[PDB]
Amino acid sequence: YDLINVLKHLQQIFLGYQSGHNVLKFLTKNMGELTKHYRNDNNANYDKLLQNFELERQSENPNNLMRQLLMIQFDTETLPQVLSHYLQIYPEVAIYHLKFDINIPYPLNIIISRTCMIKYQIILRYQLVLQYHSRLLDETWMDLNKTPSWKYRGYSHTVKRRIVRATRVLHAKMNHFIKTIMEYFNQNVIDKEVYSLEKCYRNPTLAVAIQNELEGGLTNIMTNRCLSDLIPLQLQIFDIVYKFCKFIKSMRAKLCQLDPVLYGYQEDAALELIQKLIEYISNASSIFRKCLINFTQELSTEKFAAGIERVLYSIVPP
């Protein structure tokens, strides 16, 4: 059967195993409609994304049967809502409802149980959503450093500080934190499981042991603090990063009012706008940082984790 290739493909699909270019490829184009689904009804044009995926499946490798069998469905319940049934995960007291699954033939289905598929589905949704938001922030960085309105000159130190440096300072902190989490999750969680599975194929003697490890790793991933402590807080981290990204993108136009190139775009009106943009950054940076530090402190009381320390290091100031 070549089960090794099959599972490697499954890992390539749900754990992102050596798939950085595939996740970025997935996001390419699709992010344009993905941002609309939590801003729309259940009558949303899900079909447009489904077609984009179908077209990608047409342009696919003939031997990678695991991709050929892969499909996207939409729920109405987003991750924190579906995850409300888990005892360790606290609900809000909602952005993505995109989910992937696979139809498995019996020779494999006996291994690839529905339980593991559910765990794979939910783990991937976590990985995808985090990658999604990480990507928005990265593209925002490139927009910041490309767009002429963000490269104004000779206005004031007040604006260079309150708009440009303030944007970069908050952006960098957002970036350091979201990336460090991703690094932890892969380096100290997923890599270990992929590795463990490779170890279990070293002339294994028992089929069951393999099956137990497959389930074992999926649980080890699901019970990690990066999900259990983070989800209730992730809700605010993403909402702030997401809105910030929108904000910075709109500023590609709004900040034209700092340079003569603005010419109704007049300077007193520009000051009203500039100060409103300033307040936004101040309020957003204040709440984002305070929420993260409150959490950083809470996470420091739990001794439970190599990259948890790394994540906390990335947020705790000098």
Binding site: L50, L69, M71, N103, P105
Partner: protein, 310 residues
């Protein structure tokens, strides 16, 4: 009947097919070629009265199922559809060549200064306007055949030779209407045996492939959207046929009689010119709507057609 059948035979001889018609290893396939006359509910119509046929005899009749009274003779509905495009090709092709003949002679003689200039270019522009009408049908004919009939045909022919170690697509999934695509007919781990013979089709399987083809096209917004535009091209051509004959008489008679006799030929043109303009505008708006229908369908192929109409 003598003429009807004699012509069918001539058509083959005329085509490149003629050498296979005479081939010593075959030849006989051509003998199944035949045709029919339709009672259209009217005894004097022409054109539409015709359909082409082919008759299978056992053993071939057992596999290729050319529909008989048990069904609707569906293969002739596609023939007639394609035939309507071909009828169109005849009608506009003849008239544009008639127009070029008129032009070749119309511009042959120039007299009485500017007066000649006032007319002429008025009618060469019709032949130019006409291009939108014929391009539409030529391009759609291409679409229907090259993107549907030919593709499904190729599908059948790919299937038929898969036996000889062709691409190993053994990942046949069944799409359900609810969006779930579930593997089936492949419920085996490639049937790998590890420790170690022709995938041919039997008679019913071959018959199935034939019926599959018919289904692939028959089951492929209305088919009549084409008809509105295809009929508009025909109506353009019929008006145009009259425009070309009047135009030739202008060329000869108005120049034997320098505006001395048959004055007012352009009055019949004005009636006919207004109709081609109206038809043109209707054609352009319906074509615009057609592209609108294409984008409002959701099919990537129809989006390509909307773009490629440009």
């Amino acid at each position: 009947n003598y003429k009807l059948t004699r012509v069918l035979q001539e058509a083959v001889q005329l085509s490149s097919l003629r050498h296979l018609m005479n081939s010593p290893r075959n030849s006989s396939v051509i003998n199944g070629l035949d045709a029919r006359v339709l009672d259209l509910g009217h005894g004097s119509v022409g054109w539409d009265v015709f359909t082409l046929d082919y008759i299978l005899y056992p053993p071939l009749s057992l596999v290729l199922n050319v529909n008989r009274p048990f069904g609707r003779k569906e293969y002739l509905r596609i023939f007639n559809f394609l035939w309507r495009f071909k009828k169109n090709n005849y009608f506009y092709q003849k008239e544009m060549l008639k127009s070029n003949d008129i032009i070749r002679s119309f511009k042959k003689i120039r007299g009485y200064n500017p007066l000649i200039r006032d007319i002429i270019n008025k009618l060469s522009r019709i032949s130019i306007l006409r291009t939108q009408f014929q391009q539409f049908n030529s391009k759609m004919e291409s679409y229907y055949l090259n993107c549907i009939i030919e593709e499904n045909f190729k599908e059948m022919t790919r299937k038929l030779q898969r036996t000889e170690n062709k691409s190993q697509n053994q990942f046949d999934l069944i799409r359900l209407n609810n969006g779930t695509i579930e593997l089936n007919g492949i419920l085996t781990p490639k049937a790998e045996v590890l420790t170690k013979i022709e995938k041919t089709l039997n008679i019913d399987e071959l018959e199935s492939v034939h019926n599959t083809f018919l289904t692939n096209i028959l089951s492929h917004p209305y088919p009549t959207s084409l008809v509105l535009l295809l009929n508009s091209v025909y109506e353009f051509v019929k008006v145009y046929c009259n425009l070309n004959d009047i135009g030739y008489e202008i060329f000869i008679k108005m120049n034997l009689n320098d505006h001395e006799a048959s004055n007012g030929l352009l009055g019949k043109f004005n009636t006919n010119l207004k109709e081609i303009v109206s038809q043109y505008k209707n054609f352009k708006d319906r074509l615009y709507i057609f592209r609108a229908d294409l984008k409002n369908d959701g099919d990537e192929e129809l989006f390509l057609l909307s773009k490629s109409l440009r």
